[PDB]
Amino acid sequence: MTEYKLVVVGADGVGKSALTIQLIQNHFVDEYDPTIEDSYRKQVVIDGETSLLDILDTAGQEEYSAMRDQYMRTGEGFLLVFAINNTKSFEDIHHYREQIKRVKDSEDVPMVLVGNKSDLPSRTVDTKQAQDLARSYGIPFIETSAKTRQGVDDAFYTLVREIRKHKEK
Ligand SMILES: C#Cc1c(F)ccc2cc(O)cc(-c3ncc4c(N5C[C@H]6CC[C@@H](C5)N6)nc(OC[C@@]56CCCN5C[C@H](F)C6)nc4c3F)c12
Ligand SMILES: Nc1nc2c(ncn2[C@@H]2O[C@H](COP(=O)(O)OP(=O)(O)O)[C@@H](O)[C@H]2O)c(=O)[nH]1
Ligand SMILES: [Mg+2]
């Protein structure tokens, strides 16, 4: 079986944990403990290959130690998550991408930009704004709802496929 280390990053409250649990357990958990950082495993067949996804759902205090740097460096691909009704969480994406680039020592790291909470009508981040950011980064952009499950599988599997591409270069 091939193992993939995925890391889900982004501001508090954007739905990182909801997305992760939807993928793992196939249901929407509304108010999952905002402080728990943990990793979750799922076995799935993707494009004919049996794969073990090890998903780190990030949380907790903002700190920049060598210990945390090495922890994050073990990730092979990153989901950058913002909420489409929270402009600050979108503006924070630059920060998260630069910290990834810093610890991986590379500008070519598999990443996918996710705009979550698409089920809401109160949108503040334009789809064109978000797409344009992803195009300048050269990475895929997918809008999701952990509540309705729209796009969840697609976001995670697109990241797996990006990692496969990057290993085949
Ligand atoms: C992630 C990651 C992260 C990566 F992807 C990659 C490498 C990393 C290497 C690190 O050593 C460490 C990280 C790492 N761990 C936690 C962070 C964190 N906490 C506060 C809340 C919001 C999420 C959760 C975790 N709880 N928060 C903010 O950024 C916050 C903001 C708001 C106040 C000040 N800053 C700077 C920007 F303005 C945004 N960054 C964080 C960070 F970089 C890394
Ligand atoms: N309407 C809606 N609410 C969501 C969605 N994803 C998460 N939530 C809610 O957003 C809040 C924060 O989500 P959580 O998964 O804890 O975010 P995290 O801090 O990034 O782990 C919770 O009340 C969730 O139930 C979504 O796709 N749609
Ligand atoms: Mg969480």
PDB file of all heavy atoms in Angstrom, residues 111-146:
ATOM      1  N   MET A 111       0.030  21.398  -3.352  1.00  0.00           N
ATOM      2  CA  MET A 111      -0.963  22.126  -2.568  1.00  0.00           C
ATOM      3  C   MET A 111      -2.253  22.272  -3.353  1.00  0.00           C
ATOM      4  O   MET A 111      -2.259  22.271  -4.591  1.00  0.00           O
ATOM      5  CB  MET A 111      -0.523  23.541  -2.157  1.00  0.00           C
ATOM      6  CG  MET A 111       0.832  23.670  -1.529  1.00  0.00           C
ATOM      7  SD  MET A 111       1.171  25.413  -1.153  1.00  0.00           S
ATOM      8  CE  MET A 111       2.944  25.387  -1.147  1.00  0.00           C
ATOM      9  N   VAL A 112      -3.350  22.401  -2.613  1.00  0.00           N
ATOM     10  CA  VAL A 112      -4.661  22.664  -3.203  1.00  0.00           C
ATOM     11  C   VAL A 112      -5.316  23.760  -2.379  1.00  0.00           C
ATOM     12  O   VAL A 112      -5.291  23.705  -1.145  1.00  0.00           O
ATOM     13  CB  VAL A 112      -5.545  21.396  -3.246  1.00  0.00           C
ATOM     14  CG1 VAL A 112      -6.990  21.756  -3.582  1.00  0.00           C
ATOM     15  CG2 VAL A 112      -4.982  20.399  -4.256  1.00  0.00           C
ATOM     16  N   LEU A 113      -5.861  24.778  -3.046  1.00  0.00           N
ATOM     17  CA  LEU A 113      -6.585  25.842  -2.355  1.00  0.00           C
ATOM     18  C   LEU A 113      -8.067  25.479  -2.254  1.00  0.00           C
ATOM     19  O   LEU A 113      -8.716  25.205  -3.267  1.00  0.00           O
ATOM     20  CB  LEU A 113      -6.400  27.175  -3.092  1.00  0.00           C
ATOM     21  CG  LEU A 113      -7.127  28.392  -2.511  1.00  0.00           C
ATOM     22  CD1 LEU A 113      -6.588  28.701  -1.110  1.00  0.00           C
ATOM     23  CD2 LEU A 113      -7.017  29.630  -3.434  1.00  0.00           C
ATOM     24  N   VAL A 114      -8.606  25.496  -1.035  1.00  0.00           N
ATOM     25  CA  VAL A 114      -9.982  25.079  -0.764  1.00  0.00           C
ATOM     26  C   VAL A 114     -10.748  26.262  -0.203  1.00  0.00           C
ATOM     27  O   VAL A 114     -10.381  26.794   0.854  1.00  0.00           O
ATOM     28  CB  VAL A 114     -10.036  23.898   0.219  1.00  0.00           C
ATOM     29  CG1 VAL A 114     -11.484  23.528   0.543  1.00  0.00           C
ATOM     30  CG2 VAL A 114      -9.250  22.709  -0.366  1.00  0.00           C
ATOM     31  N   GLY A 115     -11.836  26.629  -0.874  1.00  0.00           N
ATOM     32  CA  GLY A 115     -12.779  27.563  -0.278  1.00  0.00           C
ATOM     33  C   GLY A 115     -13.971  26.831   0.299  1.00  0.00           C
ATOM     34  O   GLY A 115     -14.834  26.358  -0.452  1.00  0.00           O
ATOM     35  N   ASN A 116     -14.039  26.735   1.626  1.00  0.00           N
ATOM     36  CA  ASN A 116     -15.075  25.961   2.285  1.00  0.00           C
ATOM     37  C   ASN A 116     -16.278  26.825   2.669  1.00  0.00           C
ATOM     38  O   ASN A 116     -16.218  28.062   2.677  1.00  0.00           O
ATOM     39  CB  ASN A 116     -14.493  25.276   3.518  1.00  0.00           C
ATOM     40  CG  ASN A 116     -15.407  24.252   4.098  1.00  0.00           C
ATOM     41  OD1 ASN A 116     -16.014  23.447   3.380  1.00  0.00           O
ATOM     42  ND2 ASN A 116     -15.520  24.263   5.422  1.00  0.00           N
ATOM     43  N   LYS A 117     -17.372  26.129   3.024  1.00  0.00           N
ATOM     44  CA  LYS A 117     -18.669  26.709   3.409  1.00  0.00           C
ATOM     45  C   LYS A 117     -19.427  27.276   2.202  1.00  0.00           C
ATOM     46  O   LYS A 117     -20.093  28.311   2.303  1.00  0.00           O
ATOM     47  CB  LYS A 117     -18.526  27.772   4.502  1.00  0.00           C
ATOM     48  CG  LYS A 117     -17.653  27.327   5.681  1.00  0.00           C
ATOM     49  CD  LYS A 117     -17.881  28.230   6.890  1.00  0.00           C
ATOM     50  CE  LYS A 117     -16.985  27.797   8.044  1.00  0.00           C
ATOM     51  NZ  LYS A 117     -17.227  28.600   9.251  1.00  0.00           N
ATOM     52  N   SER A 118     -19.359  26.576   1.065  1.00  0.00           N
ATOM     53  CA  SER A 118     -20.059  27.016  -0.137  1.00  0.00           C
ATOM     54  C   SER A 118     -21.571  26.931   0.004  1.00  0.00           C
ATOM     55  O   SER A 118     -22.286  27.501  -0.827  1.00  0.00           O
ATOM     56  CB  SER A 118     -19.637  26.177  -1.342  1.00  0.00           C
ATOM     57  OG  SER A 118     -20.074  24.837  -1.178  1.00  0.00           O
ATOM     58  N   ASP A 119     -22.070  26.216   1.013  1.00  0.00           N
ATOM     59  CA  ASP A 119     -23.507  26.154   1.263  1.00  0.00           C
ATOM     60  C   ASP A 119     -24.067  27.468   1.792  1.00  0.00           C
ATOM     61  O   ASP A 119     -25.291  27.609   1.881  1.00  0.00           O
ATOM     62  CB  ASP A 119     -23.818  25.047   2.261  1.00  0.00           C
ATOM     63  CG  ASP A 119     -23.062  25.221   3.560  1.00  0.00           C
ATOM     64  OD1 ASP A 119     -21.825  25.067   3.538  1.00  0.00           O
ATOM     65  OD2 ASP A 119     -23.689  25.539   4.592  1.00  0.00           O
ATOM     66  N   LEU A 120     -23.215  28.428   2.144  1.00  0.00           N
ATOM     67  CA  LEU A 120     -23.731  29.654   2.746  1.00  0.00           C
ATOM     68  C   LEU A 120     -24.019  30.701   1.673  1.00  0.00           C
ATOM     69  O   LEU A 120     -23.310  30.764   0.664  1.00  0.00           O
ATOM     70  CB  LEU A 120     -22.730  30.229   3.743  1.00  0.00           C
ATOM     71  CG  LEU A 120     -22.443  29.392   4.985  1.00  0.00           C
ATOM     72  CD1 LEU A 120     -21.382  30.086   5.830  1.00  0.00           C
ATOM     73  CD2 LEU A 120     -23.716  29.163   5.796  1.00  0.00           C
ATOM     74  N   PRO A 121     -25.057  31.523   1.855  1.00  0.00           N
ATOM     75  CA  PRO A 121     -25.296  32.626   0.912  1.00  0.00           C
ATOM     76  C   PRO A 121     -24.494  33.886   1.213  1.00  0.00           C
ATOM     77  O   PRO A 121     -24.381  34.748   0.333  1.00  0.00           O
ATOM     78  CB  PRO A 121     -26.798  32.883   1.067  1.00  0.00           C
ATOM     79  CG  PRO A 121     -27.047  32.576   2.514  1.00  0.00           C
ATOM     80  CD  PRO A 121     -26.157  31.381   2.826  1.00  0.00           C
ATOM     81  N   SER A 122     -23.919  34.014   2.408  1.00  0.00           N
ATOM     82  CA  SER A 122     -23.280  35.258   2.839  1.00  0.00           C
ATOM     83  C   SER A 122     -21.835  35.398   2.360  1.00  0.00           C
ATOM     84  O   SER A 122     -20.948  35.713   3.163  1.00  0.00           O
ATOM     85  CB  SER A 122     -23.309  35.360   4.369  1.00  0.00           C
ATOM     86  OG  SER A 122     -23.062  34.097   4.982  1.00  0.00           O
ATOM     87  N   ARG A 123     -21.590  35.206   1.065  1.00  0.00           N
ATOM     88  CA  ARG A 123     -20.228  35.134   0.545  1.00  0.00           C
ATOM     89  C   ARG A 123     -19.531  36.495   0.556  1.00  0.00           C
ATOM     90  O   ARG A 123     -20.104  37.499   0.127  1.00  0.00           O
ATOM     91  CB  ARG A 123     -20.257  34.594  -0.877  1.00  0.00           C
ATOM     92  CG  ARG A 123     -18.955  34.747  -1.576  1.00  0.00           C
ATOM     93  CD  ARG A 123     -19.017  34.253  -2.993  1.00  0.00           C
ATOM     94  NE  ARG A 123     -19.249  32.822  -3.099  1.00  0.00           N
ATOM     95  CZ  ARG A 123     -18.312  31.931  -3.396  1.00  0.00           C
ATOM     96  NH1 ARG A 123     -17.032  32.270  -3.485  1.00  0.00           N
ATOM     97  NH2 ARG A 123     -18.670  30.672  -3.635  1.00  0.00           N
ATOM     98  N   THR A 124     -18.275  36.529   1.033  1.00  0.00           N
ATOM     99  CA  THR A 124     -17.464  37.737   0.988  1.00  0.00           C
ATOM    100  C   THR A 124     -16.210  37.603   0.131  1.00  0.00           C
ATOM    101  O   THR A 124     -15.629  38.623  -0.255  1.00  0.00           O
ATOM    102  CB  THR A 124     -17.074  38.174   2.415  1.00  0.00           C
ATOM    103  OG1 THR A 124     -16.218  37.193   3.009  1.00  0.00           O
ATOM    104  CG2 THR A 124     -18.302  38.328   3.279  1.00  0.00           C
ATOM    105  N   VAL A 125     -15.802  36.395  -0.227  1.00  0.00           N
ATOM    106  CA  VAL A 125     -14.648  36.192  -1.089  1.00  0.00           C
ATOM    107  C   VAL A 125     -15.159  35.761  -2.450  1.00  0.00           C
ATOM    108  O   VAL A 125     -15.797  34.708  -2.577  1.00  0.00           O
ATOM    109  CB  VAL A 125     -13.663  35.160  -0.514  1.00  0.00           C
ATOM    110  CG1 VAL A 125     -12.460  35.011  -1.444  1.00  0.00           C
ATOM    111  CG2 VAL A 125     -13.219  35.578   0.888  1.00  0.00           C
ATOM    112  N   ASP A 126     -14.891  36.585  -3.457  1.00  0.00           N
ATOM    113  CA  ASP A 126     -15.335  36.306  -4.814  1.00  0.00           C
ATOM    114  C   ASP A 126     -14.663  35.044  -5.342  1.00  0.00           C
ATOM    115  O   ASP A 126     -13.474  34.824  -5.115  1.00  0.00           O
ATOM    116  CB  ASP A 126     -14.939  37.475  -5.721  1.00  0.00           C
ATOM    117  CG  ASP A 126     -16.110  38.297  -6.172  1.00  0.00           C
ATOM    118  OD1 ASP A 126     -17.145  38.302  -5.464  1.00  0.00           O
ATOM    119  OD2 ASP A 126     -15.988  38.927  -7.250  1.00  0.00           O
ATOM    120  N   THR A 127     -15.416  34.235  -6.094  1.00  0.00           N
ATOM    121  CA  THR A 127     -14.801  33.074  -6.730  1.00  0.00           C
ATOM    122  C   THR A 127     -13.693  33.487  -7.689  1.00  0.00           C
ATOM    123  O   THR A 127     -12.677  32.792  -7.809  1.00  0.00           O
ATOM    124  CB  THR A 127     -15.848  32.231  -7.455  1.00  0.00           C
ATOM    125  OG1 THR A 127     -16.860  31.835  -6.525  1.00  0.00           O
ATOM    126  CG2 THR A 127     -15.221  30.995  -8.014  1.00  0.00           C
ATOM    127  N   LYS A 128     -13.859  34.618  -8.388  1.00  0.00           N
ATOM    128  CA  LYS A 128     -12.800  35.025  -9.306  1.00  0.00           C
ATOM    129  C   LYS A 128     -11.549  35.428  -8.536  1.00  0.00           C
ATOM    130  O   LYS A 128     -10.436  35.078  -8.940  1.00  0.00           O
ATOM    131  CB  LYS A 128     -13.254  36.161 -10.235  1.00  0.00           C
ATOM    132  CG  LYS A 128     -12.077  36.756 -11.018  1.00  0.00           C
ATOM    133  CD  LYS A 128     -12.400  37.082 -12.453  1.00  0.00           C
ATOM    134  CE  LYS A 128     -11.123  37.332 -13.263  1.00  0.00           C
ATOM    135  NZ  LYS A 128     -10.177  38.288 -12.629  1.00  0.00           N
ATOM    136  N   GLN A 129     -11.712  36.160  -7.423  1.00  0.00           N
ATOM    137  CA  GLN A 129     -10.573  36.526  -6.579  1.00  0.00           C
ATOM    138  C   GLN A 129      -9.773  35.286  -6.173  1.00  0.00           C
ATOM    139  O   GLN A 129      -8.534  35.227  -6.313  1.00  0.00           O
ATOM    140  CB  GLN A 129     -11.072  37.265  -5.331  1.00  0.00           C
ATOM    141  CG  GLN A 129     -10.011  38.094  -4.635  1.00  0.00           C
ATOM    142  CD  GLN A 129     -10.600  39.013  -3.571  1.00  0.00           C
ATOM    143  OE1 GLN A 129     -11.746  38.816  -3.139  1.00  0.00           O
ATOM    144  NE2 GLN A 129      -9.815  39.992  -3.115  1.00  0.00           N
ATOM    145  N   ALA A 130     -10.484  34.273  -5.682  1.00  0.00           N
ATOM    146  CA  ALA A 130      -9.839  33.064  -5.196  1.00  0.00           C
ATOM    147  C   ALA A 130      -9.167  32.313  -6.336  1.00  0.00           C
ATOM    148  O   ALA A 130      -8.023  31.857  -6.205  1.00  0.00           O
ATOM    149  CB  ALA A 130     -10.876  32.190  -4.498  1.00  0.00           C
ATOM    150  N   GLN A 131      -9.875  32.161  -7.466  1.00  0.00           N
ATOM    151  CA  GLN A 131      -9.291  31.488  -8.623  1.00  0.00           C
ATOM    152  C   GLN A 131      -8.019  32.165  -9.068  1.00  0.00           C
ATOM    153  O   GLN A 131      -7.053  31.504  -9.446  1.00  0.00           O
ATOM    154  CB  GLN A 131     -10.240  31.527  -9.823  1.00  0.00           C
ATOM    155  CG  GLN A 131     -11.354  30.591  -9.898  1.00  0.00           C
ATOM    156  CD  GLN A 131     -12.365  31.152 -10.874  1.00  0.00           C
ATOM    157  OE1 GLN A 131     -13.550  31.221 -10.563  1.00  0.00           O
ATOM    158  NE2 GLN A 131     -11.885  31.654 -12.025  1.00  0.00           N
ATOM    159  N   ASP A 132      -8.036  33.496  -9.109  1.00  0.00           N
ATOM    160  CA  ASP A 132      -6.871  34.230  -9.575  1.00  0.00           C
ATOM    161  C   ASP A 132      -5.683  33.994  -8.657  1.00  0.00           C
ATOM    162  O   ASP A 132      -4.544  33.887  -9.123  1.00  0.00           O
ATOM    163  CB  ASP A 132      -7.194  35.715  -9.695  1.00  0.00           C
ATOM    164  CG  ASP A 132      -8.067  36.025 -10.904  1.00  0.00           C
ATOM    165  OD1 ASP A 132      -8.253  35.121 -11.761  1.00  0.00           O
ATOM    166  OD2 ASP A 132      -8.569  37.160 -10.982  1.00  0.00           O
ATOM    167  N   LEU A 133      -5.916  33.991  -7.346  1.00  0.00           N
ATOM    168  CA  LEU A 133      -4.828  33.641  -6.426  1.00  0.00           C
ATOM    169  C   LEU A 133      -4.263  32.257  -6.746  1.00  0.00           C
ATOM    170  O   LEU A 133      -3.045  32.081  -6.872  1.00  0.00           O
ATOM    171  CB  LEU A 133      -5.318  33.692  -4.977  1.00  0.00           C
ATOM    172  CG  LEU A 133      -4.197  33.514  -3.944  1.00  0.00           C
ATOM    173  CD1 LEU A 133      -3.171  34.639  -4.087  1.00  0.00           C
ATOM    174  CD2 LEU A 133      -4.759  33.485  -2.541  1.00  0.00           C
ATOM    175  N   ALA A 134      -5.145  31.255  -6.880  1.00  0.00           N
ATOM    176  CA  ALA A 134      -4.687  29.897  -7.184  1.00  0.00           C
ATOM    177  C   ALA A 134      -3.931  29.838  -8.513  1.00  0.00           C
ATOM    178  O   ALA A 134      -2.974  29.071  -8.658  1.00  0.00           O
ATOM    179  CB  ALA A 134      -5.875  28.929  -7.200  1.00  0.00           C
ATOM    180  N   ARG A 135      -4.364  30.613  -9.511  1.00  0.00           N
ATOM    181  CA  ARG A 135      -3.652  30.618 -10.792  1.00  0.00           C
ATOM    182  C   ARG A 135      -2.268  31.253 -10.653  1.00  0.00           C
ATOM    183  O   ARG A 135      -1.301  30.794 -11.273  1.00  0.00           O
ATOM    184  CB  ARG A 135      -4.478  31.339 -11.865  1.00  0.00           C
ATOM    185  CG  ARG A 135      -5.787  30.619 -12.200  1.00  0.00           C
ATOM    186  CD  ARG A 135      -6.617  31.315 -13.276  1.00  0.00           C
ATOM    187  NE  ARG A 135      -7.882  30.605 -13.458  1.00  0.00           N
ATOM    188  CZ  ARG A 135      -8.689  30.758 -14.501  1.00  0.00           C
ATOM    189  NH1 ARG A 135      -8.397  31.598 -15.479  1.00  0.00           N
ATOM    190  NH2 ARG A 135      -9.798  30.023 -14.578  1.00  0.00           N
ATOM    191  N   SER A 136      -2.147  32.309  -9.846  1.00  0.00           N
ATOM    192  CA  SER A 136      -0.815  32.871  -9.618  1.00  0.00           C
ATOM    193  C   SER A 136       0.083  31.892  -8.861  1.00  0.00           C
ATOM    194  O   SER A 136       1.298  31.846  -9.105  1.00  0.00           O
ATOM    195  CB  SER A 136      -0.920  34.206  -8.884  1.00  0.00           C
ATOM    196  OG  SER A 136      -1.291  34.015  -7.540  1.00  0.00           O
ATOM    197  N   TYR A 137      -0.491  31.088  -7.965  1.00  0.00           N
ATOM    198  CA  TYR A 137       0.271  30.037  -7.296  1.00  0.00           C
ATOM    199  C   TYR A 137       0.508  28.812  -8.169  1.00  0.00           C
ATOM    200  O   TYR A 137       1.376  27.994  -7.836  1.00  0.00           O
ATOM    201  CB  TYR A 137      -0.451  29.570  -6.026  1.00  0.00           C
ATOM    202  CG  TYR A 137      -0.551  30.564  -4.889  1.00  0.00           C
ATOM    203  CD1 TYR A 137      -1.415  30.313  -3.826  1.00  0.00           C
ATOM    204  CD2 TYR A 137       0.218  31.724  -4.852  1.00  0.00           C
ATOM    205  CE1 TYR A 137      -1.513  31.188  -2.760  1.00  0.00           C
ATOM    206  CE2 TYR A 137       0.123  32.620  -3.768  1.00  0.00           C
ATOM    207  CZ  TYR A 137      -0.746  32.330  -2.734  1.00  0.00           C
ATOM    208  OH  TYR A 137      -0.887  33.162  -1.641  1.00  0.00           O
ATOM    209  N   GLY A 138      -0.260  28.645  -9.245  1.00  0.00           N
ATOM    210  CA  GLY A 138      -0.159  27.461 -10.081  1.00  0.00           C
ATOM    211  C   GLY A 138      -0.746  26.191  -9.487  1.00  0.00           C
ATOM    212  O   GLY A 138      -0.225  25.102  -9.753  1.00  0.00           O
ATOM    213  N   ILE A 139      -1.811  26.289  -8.696  1.00  0.00           N
ATOM    214  CA  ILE A 139      -2.335  25.121  -7.983  1.00  0.00           C
ATOM    215  C   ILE A 139      -3.839  25.057  -8.209  1.00  0.00           C
ATOM    216  O   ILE A 139      -4.466  26.058  -8.583  1.00  0.00           O
ATOM    217  CB  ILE A 139      -2.035  25.191  -6.465  1.00  0.00           C
ATOM    218  CG1 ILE A 139      -2.722  26.409  -5.858  1.00  0.00           C
ATOM    219  CG2 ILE A 139      -0.550  25.264  -6.193  1.00  0.00           C
ATOM    220  CD1 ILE A 139      -2.682  26.450  -4.307  1.00  0.00           C
ATOM    221  N   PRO A 140      -4.450  23.898  -7.968  1.00  0.00           N
ATOM    222  CA  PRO A 140      -5.902  23.787  -8.130  1.00  0.00           C
ATOM    223  C   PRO A 140      -6.661  24.549  -7.056  1.00  0.00           C
ATOM    224  O   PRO A 140      -6.172  24.791  -5.950  1.00  0.00           O
ATOM    225  CB  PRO A 140      -6.159  22.278  -8.007  1.00  0.00           C
ATOM    226  CG  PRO A 140      -4.855  21.642  -8.291  1.00  0.00           C
ATOM    227  CD  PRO A 140      -3.817  22.583  -7.779  1.00  0.00           C
ATOM    228  N   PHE A 141      -7.893  24.921  -7.410  1.00  0.00           N
ATOM    229  CA  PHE A 141      -8.822  25.612  -6.527  1.00  0.00           C
ATOM    230  C   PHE A 141     -10.156  24.884  -6.566  1.00  0.00           C
ATOM    231  O   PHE A 141     -10.726  24.681  -7.647  1.00  0.00           O
ATOM    232  CB  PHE A 141      -9.024  27.070  -6.942  1.00  0.00           C
ATOM    233  CG  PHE A 141     -10.145  27.744  -6.213  1.00  0.00           C
ATOM    234  CD1 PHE A 141     -10.136  27.826  -4.831  1.00  0.00           C
ATOM    235  CD2 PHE A 141     -11.224  28.279  -6.907  1.00  0.00           C
ATOM    236  CE1 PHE A 141     -11.185  28.437  -4.153  1.00  0.00           C
ATOM    237  CE2 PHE A 141     -12.271  28.898  -6.234  1.00  0.00           C
ATOM    238  CZ  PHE A 141     -12.256  28.974  -4.861  1.00  0.00           C
ATOM    239  N   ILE A 142     -10.656  24.503  -5.396  1.00  0.00           N
ATOM    240  CA  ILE A 142     -11.923  23.789  -5.282  1.00  0.00           C
ATOM    241  C   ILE A 142     -12.745  24.409  -4.163  1.00  0.00           C
ATOM    242  O   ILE A 142     -12.219  24.683  -3.077  1.00  0.00           O
ATOM    243  CB  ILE A 142     -11.691  22.289  -5.023  1.00  0.00           C
ATOM    244  CG1 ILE A 142     -10.801  21.707  -6.125  1.00  0.00           C
ATOM    245  CG2 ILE A 142     -13.021  21.527  -4.895  1.00  0.00           C
ATOM    246  CD1 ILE A 142     -10.347  20.310  -5.850  1.00  0.00           C
ATOM    247  N   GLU A 143     -14.036  24.631  -4.418  1.00  0.00           N
ATOM    248  CA  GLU A 143     -14.943  25.104  -3.377  1.00  0.00           C
ATOM    249  C   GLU A 143     -15.677  23.904  -2.806  1.00  0.00           C
ATOM    250  O   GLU A 143     -16.112  23.026  -3.556  1.00  0.00           O
ATOM    251  CB  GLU A 143     -15.944  26.149  -3.896  1.00  0.00           C
ATOM    252  CG  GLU A 143     -15.299  27.418  -4.428  1.00  0.00           C
ATOM    253  CD  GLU A 143     -16.224  28.636  -4.443  1.00  0.00           C
ATOM    254  OE1 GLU A 143     -17.459  28.459  -4.449  1.00  0.00           O
ATOM    255  OE2 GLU A 143     -15.708  29.782  -4.495  1.00  0.00           O
ATOM    256  N   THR A 144     -15.799  23.858  -1.477  1.00  0.00           N
ATOM    257  CA  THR A 144     -16.350  22.707  -0.767  1.00  0.00           C
ATOM    258  C   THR A 144     -17.426  23.142   0.215  1.00  0.00           C
ATOM    259  O   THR A 144     -17.521  24.310   0.603  1.00  0.00           O
ATOM    260  CB  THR A 144     -15.277  21.947   0.032  1.00  0.00           C
ATOM    261  OG1 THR A 144     -14.736  22.818   1.051  1.00  0.00           O
ATOM    262  CG2 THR A 144     -14.154  21.447  -0.884  1.00  0.00           C
ATOM    263  N   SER A 145     -18.216  22.162   0.638  1.00  0.00           N
ATOM    264  CA  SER A 145     -19.042  22.278   1.830  1.00  0.00           C
ATOM    265  C   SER A 145     -18.877  21.002   2.629  1.00  0.00           C
ATOM    266  O   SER A 145     -19.292  19.929   2.178  1.00  0.00           O
ATOM    267  CB  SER A 145     -20.520  22.509   1.485  1.00  0.00           C
ATOM    268  OG  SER A 145     -21.303  22.477   2.667  1.00  0.00           O
ATOM    269  N   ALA A 146     -18.282  21.107   3.822  1.00  0.00           N
ATOM    270  CA  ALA A 146     -18.277  19.951   4.697  1.00  0.00           C
ATOM    271  C   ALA A 146     -19.687  19.619   5.172  1.00  0.00           C
ATOM    272  O   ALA A 146     -19.959  18.467   5.518  1.00  0.00           O
ATOM    273  CB  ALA A 146     -17.347  20.195   5.892  1.00  0.00           C
TER     274      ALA A 146
END
